[PDB]
C-alpha cells in the first residue's frame, strides 16, 4: 500500500535471524551498541552549521546533502577486520530501499560526492565518531535511526529509540540541492527570518501588516509533516520541492482535502476567528494539528502567511508577494470578460470574472528540472482557493520567468497566474451576437511588491512578472500567453559563440506565402546558472522587419562581449527569447532556446619540484580558438603564494595556433596554493585557466 505517512512506522527486528539458526548460537562475538550520541544540542556544531539551531525541537535536525557528526559507543572496539555494520534511516510504515524510504548508510573510507555514507573520523576506546553525509536529493521528513551489525546468522539491530529520530530538511546552503540559494543575505531573509511584513491596501495608500511566521516554534515542524500526511502525500516525493510546494498550495486551504484554513469573505465569520484578527501562523497551525480539522477563517494574506511558514519551516526559501488590482479569470481565456447590458451598465448576471483590490500569494525558490533551462528560480504558488487545477483548489508552481515572457504552456497553472498580473479588460455587449466595446490594457496588476531584505520596506517586483505597460514587449508577451492559452516560419541560431568575444544571434524568417508581411518582434538575452535558474537579462531589443513574399530573411543581432562578460559565472548558459508578431495577421511566433558558450582553454603545467624556497617552472599554454588572428595578446600569471604576478605579451597569435610561456617562480608559502592564468587580446578577452599546486 502507499507509503504516505511520516507518522506511521514499521517495527524493525532487533534480532533478524536468517534460515534455521542452531540452538546455542552465541551472539557474544559480535558488536552491540551501548550508546548513540548525536551531538544534537542547539549550541553544538551540527545544528549551528546546519542552520537548524533555532528550532524549538530537542531532536537532531539537519539539512540534506551536508555532513554531520555522530558517535557510536560499542561493547568492544570496532575492528574492521572482523566487524561490519551500517547505519540505517527509515521513514514511514512501508519503507523500501528503491523508494528512498529505507536508507542504508555504509561505513566508508572516504565520503563520495552526493552519496549517503559515513566516515570514521575518530576512535577512542570503544567509541567511533562518524561523519555522516546525506544525499542532496534525500526525502524531507522525520527519520528513525538504527545501527545494524551484520553476522553470519543475520542482522543485529538497535531497538526503537525515539531520542535518535532525526529530521532531514531542504538545504538552501548546499550547492547540489534543488533549493540552493547562493546569497547568504537572501537565505537569511527567505529561510531563517521568522517574522515578516505583508503589503495590502490600495496602490496609492499602501498598508503594511506584520506577520509572525513562527517556523521555529515548538510543534510547527511536526505540524508541517502532519500536513503532508494529511494530504496522503507519498513519502518518495517529499524530497522534491516542486511536489512539496504543489501539495502545500492545496493543503493550506480547506477545500477538497480537509486542509488548514477555511476561506471566508462574508463580513460575519460565524463560529470562528475573523481573517483580520490573526497576526501570524502559529496559532492556526497548532490548532489544525490539535483539532485535526480545518481552522475558520482566512483570506489571501492569511493563506499566504501560513503557506510561507510551511515553506520556510521545511527549508524551501519563500516570500510573500502582493499584486494590486488582481484579476480573477473564471473561464480560462486569460482576459477579463466584462459583459455590458444595452443600457451600458454592467450585466452582473453574465459577468463572472472579477478584480480584487489586492491579492497575496507565495513564491518558492527552486530549480525546475521538469522545464527547459532558464525557468528555475522564483515559482509562484498560491493556496488561496480561486480556480480548480486538475480537480483541486491549488495553484503552482508556475515559473515567474515563464510568466514574464508569456510561455504559459509550462506547468503548473501559469495561464491563471499570468491573467492575475496582466490580463486585459474586454468590455463586451451581449445582444439578442457579441460586440466588443472597449479594451483596457493597463488596469490589472498595477504593482507587485514583497518585503525588502534587511528592513520592513517594500520592494517593487512588478518587472519580474511582466514587461512595463506601454512597452511593445508587454503586448508581444501577452499575445504569446494568449497563444499558448500566415505561412511564416521563424527560427534562430546563435552562431559560433565563444566566451570572451562578440557574437551574432541570427534570427531567420521564411515566408512561404505570396503576401508581404510586416513583423514586430522582441529579443531577450539572459544569463542562467547551469542548474537552469535565471540570473539576469543582459540584452533586450525590439525590432521591425518587412518580409517579402516567397523569401528567406536573416536578421543579425550583434551581442557584444561587454554586454554579457560582466555577469557571467561558472558553467552559466545563455537563454534567448524571440517573439515575433506578423502584424497583418496578428499571428505570433515565439521561441526560446539556451546555449552554452564555447570556452577557450588555457593550460597550466609545472615542471620542477614544488618546494618553497627553490625554483619551479610554470608553463602556460594557450591555443587560439578562433579562425581569426588575435592581436596584442596579454597573458597574465598570478599565484598568491607561488609567484609574484607576471605578464607576457604576444603581438600576434595566428588562427588555431598555440603559444607557450615559461615562467620561473619561487614559492614563499607552502601547502595548498594555486596558479591562475588570464588572457586578453584586442578581440578575445578575459579567458582564464587555473591549477591547484601543492608546495
Amino acid at each position: 500500500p502507499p507509503n504516505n505517512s511520516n507518522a506511521a512506522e514499521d517495527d524493525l527486528p532487533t534480532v533478524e535471524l536468517q534460515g534455521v539458526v542452531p540452538r546455542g548460537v552465541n551472539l557474544q562475538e559480535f558488536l552491540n551498541v551501548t550508546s548513540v550520541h548525536l551531538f544534537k544540542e542547539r549550541w553544538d556544531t551540527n545544528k549551528v552549521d546546519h542552520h537548524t539551531d533555532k528550532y524549538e525541537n530537542n531532536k537532531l535536525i539537519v539539512r540534506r546533502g551536508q555532513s554531520f557528526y555522530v558517535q557510536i559507543d560499542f561493547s568492544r572496539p570496532y575492528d574492521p577486520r572482523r566487524d561490519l555494520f551500517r547505519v540505517e534511516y527509515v521513514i514511514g510504515r512501508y519503507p523500501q530501499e528503491n523508494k528512498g524510504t529505507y536508507i542504508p548508510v555504509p561505513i566508508v573510507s572516504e565520503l563520495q560526492s552526493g552519496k549517503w555514507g559515513a566516515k570514521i573520523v575518530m576512535r577512542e576506546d570503544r567509541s567511533v565518531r562518524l561523519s555522516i553525509q546525506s544525499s542532496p536529493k534525500c526525502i524531507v521528513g522525520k527519520f528513525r535511526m538504527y545501527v545494524a551489525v551484520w553476522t553470519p546468522y543475520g542482522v543485529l539491530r538497535t531497538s526503537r529509540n525515539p531520542e535518535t529520530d532525526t529530521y532531514i530538511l531542504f538545504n538552501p546552503w548546499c550547492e547540489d540541492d534543488a533549493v540552493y540559494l547562493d546569497n547568504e543575505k537572501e537565505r537569511e531573509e527567505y529561510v531563517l527570518n521568522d517574522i515578516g511584513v505583508i503589503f495590502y491596501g490600495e496602490v496609492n495608500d499602501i498598508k503594511t501588516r506584520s506577520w509572525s511566521y513562527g517556523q521555529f516554534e515548538d510543534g510547527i515542524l511536526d505540524t508541517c509533516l502532519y500536513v503532508m500526511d494529511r494530504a496522503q502525500m507519498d513519502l518518495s516525493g517529499r524530497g522534491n520541492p516542486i511536489k512539496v510546494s504543489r501539495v502545500g498550495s492545496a493543503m493550506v486551504n480547506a477545500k477538497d482535502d480537509e486542509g488548514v484554513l477555511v476561506g471566508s469573505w462574508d463580513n460575519i465569520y460565524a463560529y470562528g476567528v475573523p481573517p483580520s484578527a490573526w497576526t501570524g501562523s502559529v496559532d492556526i497551525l497548532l490548532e489544525y494539528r490539535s483539532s485535526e480539522n480545518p481552522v475558520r477563517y482566512g483570506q489571501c494574506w492569511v493563506f499566504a502567511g501560513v503557506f510561507n511558514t510551511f515553506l520556510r519551516c521545511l527549508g524551501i526559501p519563500a516570500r510573500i508577494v502582493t499584486n494590486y488590482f488582481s484579476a480573477h479569470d473564471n473561464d480560462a481565456n486569460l482576459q477579463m470578460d466584462i459583459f455590458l447590458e444595452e443600457d451600458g451598465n454592467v450585466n452582473s448576471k453574465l459577468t463572472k470574472d472579477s478584480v480584487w483590490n489586492y491579492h497575496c500569494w507565495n513564491e518558492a525558490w527552486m530549480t525546475r528540472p521538469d522545464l527547459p533551462v532558464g525557468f528555475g528560480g522564483w515559482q509562484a504558488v498560491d493556496s488561496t482557493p480561486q480556480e480548480n487545477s486538475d480537480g483541486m483548489y491549488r495553484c503552482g508552481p508556475a515559473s515567474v520567468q515563464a510568466i514574464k515572457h508569456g510561455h504559459v504552456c509550462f506547468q503548473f497553472d501559469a495561464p491563471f497566474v499570468f491573467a492575475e498580473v496582466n490580463s486585459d479588460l474586454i468590455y463586451i455587449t451581449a445582444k439578442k451576437t457579441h460586440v466588443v466595446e472597449n479594451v483596457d490594457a493597463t488596469h490589472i496588476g498595477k504593482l507587485i511588491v514583497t518585503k525588502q531584505i534587511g528592513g520592513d520596506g517594500m520592494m517593487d517586483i512588478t518587472d519580474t512578472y511582466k514587461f512595463q505597460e506601454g512597452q511593445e514587449e508587454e503586448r508581444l508577451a501577452l499575445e504569446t500567453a494568449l497563444m499558448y492559452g500566415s505561412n511564416v516560419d521563424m527560427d534562430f541560431e546563435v552562431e559560433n559563440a565563444v566566451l570572451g568575444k562578440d557574437f551574432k544571434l541570427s534570427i531567420t524568417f521564411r515566408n512561404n506565402s505570396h503576401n508581404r508581411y510586416t513583423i514586430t518582434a522582441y529579443l531577450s538575452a539572459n544569463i542562467t546558472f547551469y542548474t537552469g535558474v535565471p540570473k539576469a537579462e543582459f540584452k533586450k531589443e525590439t525590432f521591425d522587419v518587412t518580409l517579402e513574399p516567397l523569401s528567406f530573411k536573416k536578421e543579425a543581432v550583434l551581442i557584444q562581449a561587454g554586454e554579457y562578460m560582466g555577469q557571467l559565472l561558472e558553467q552559466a548558459s545563455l537563454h534567448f527569447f524571440v517573439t515575433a508578431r506578423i502584424n497583418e495577421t496578428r499571428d505570433v511566433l515565439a521561441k526560446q532556446k539556451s546555449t552554452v558558450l564555447t570556452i577557450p582553454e588555457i593550460i597550466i603545467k609545472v615542471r620542477g619540484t614544488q618546494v618553497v624556497g627553490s625554483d619551479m617552472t610554470v608553463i602556460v599554454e594557450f591555443t587560439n580558438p578562433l579562425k581569426e588572428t588575435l592581436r596584442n595578446v596579454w597573458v597574465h600569471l598570478d599565484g598568491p603564494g607561488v609567484t609574484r604576478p607576471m605578464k607576457k605579451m604576444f603581438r600576434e597569435i595566428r588562427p588555431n595556433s598555440t603559444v607557450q610561456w615559461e615562467e620561473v617562480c619561487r614559492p614563499w608559502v607552502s601547502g595548498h596554493r594555486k596558479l591562475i592564468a588570464s588572457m586578453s587580446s584586442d578581440s578575445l578577452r578575459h579567458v582564464y585557466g587555473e591549477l591547484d599546486v601543492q608546495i
Binding site: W265, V346, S354, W356, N357, Y358
Partner: peptide, 8 residues
Amino acid sequence: XXALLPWP
C-alpha cells in the same frame, strides 16, 4: 480585507 472592486 480583500474585496472585489467594480470595473473601472
